[PDB]
């Protein structure tokens, strides 16, 4: 028997929606915007992604505004010729039944990994917030509830992060209509539930069957090789260095501090001499503080060289 949340997802997804089957490849989104934008009690329409291994046909779903008489809806849409070869025939919307939740691997429920997925989850919430122009306090409000109102050990040590992960994931199913576990976006809930109708389960993480030092060692080693073989392809910023030019510009932006709208002071050595523009200070540094600029130039270069050296000398303090 489906869970309250899965049963509720199911009913929501079908409510005030018509299925339109056998949508041909040649049928464009503009053709559909024509047919439906004119109709006022339609709020949204969704198109399944074509799957050629099965066939050329997609599915079209018409989502109607709340309290829409669904006899009128069929009546309002049925008979519409999108193109010569396809006339719209609506039908009641479906979702695959009698299925088991799709199991997510052990690894998704481990301390290390769960938290990675957490950063991604947050980022997908913010993406959805900007993309669909929503409030930016979703992750905030979710975690606030989960902290305040607990839920009944039978629990791993990872529980707080799993609960939150699971719900950040469920937020994206319901609102974004994104399936985090596959990284597929969809146009509607009904579309998503075609591929995950029972939702997902979690395989439990065994602290005993944990087996990754070897893979770190290898990883770091292959990263070292890259520094020697493909320095141009290596993430210098990630290693706390910059391209010479960029480093030097970041030094100039730091030392030319803005006091007022049209007042910009020099902060190179004891110098505190003011100027009525940012680029007025940039000349000063070239003339007086040559010594300082040479130094920055040298440091910029050496810093680039240093980080790309697999077995460089290292600060004693940064080992045990």
């Amino acid at each position: 028997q489906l869970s309250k949340w899965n049963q509720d997802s199911r009913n929501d997804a079908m409510e005030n929606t018509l299925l339109v089957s056998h949508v041909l490849p040649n049928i464009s989104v503009a053709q559909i915007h024509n047919a439906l934008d004119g109709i006022s009690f339609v709020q949204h329409f969704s198109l399944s992604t074509i799957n050629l291994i099965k066939n050329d046909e997609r599915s079209l779903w018409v989502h109607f505004k709340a309290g829409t008489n669904m006899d009128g809806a069929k009546e309002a849409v049925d008979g519409i010729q999108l193109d010569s070869n396809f006339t719209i025939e609506s039908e009641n919307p479906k979702i695959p039944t009698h299925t088991h939740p799709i199991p997510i691997f052990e690894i998704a429920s481990s301390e290390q990994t769960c938290k990675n997925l957490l950063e991604k989850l947050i980022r997908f919430i913010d993406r959805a917030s900007t993309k669909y122009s929503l409030p930016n306090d979703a992750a905030q409000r979710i975690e606030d509830r989960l902290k305040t109102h607990a839920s009944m050990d039978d629990k791993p040590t990872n529980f707080h992060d799993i609960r939150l992960s699971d719900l950040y994931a469920e937020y994206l199913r319901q609102v974004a209509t994104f399936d985090f576990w596959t990284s597929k976006e969809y146009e509607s809930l009904i579309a998503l539930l075609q591929d995950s109708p029972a939702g997902y389960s979690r395989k439990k993480f065994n602290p005993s069957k944990e087996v990754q030092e070897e893979n770190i060692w290898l990883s770091d080693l292959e990263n070292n090789f890259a520094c020697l073989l493909e320095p141009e392809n290596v993430d210098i910023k990630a290693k706390g260095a910059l391209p010479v030019e960029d480093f030097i510009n970041n030094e100039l932006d730091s030392v030319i501090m803005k006091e007022d709208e049209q007042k910009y002071r020099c902060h190179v050595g004891t110098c505190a001499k003011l100027f009525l523009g940012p680029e007025f200070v940039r000349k000063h540094i070239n003339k007086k503080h040559k010594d300082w600029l040479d130094h920055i130039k040298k440091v910029a270069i050496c810093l680039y060289g240093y980080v790309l050296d697999p077995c460089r000398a290292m600060d004693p303090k940064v080992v045990s």
Binding site: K263, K273, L274, F275, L276, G277, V281, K283
Partner: peptide
Amino acid sequence: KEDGEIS
């Protein structure tokens, strides 16, 4: 004084 100096 230099260019833009505002003592």
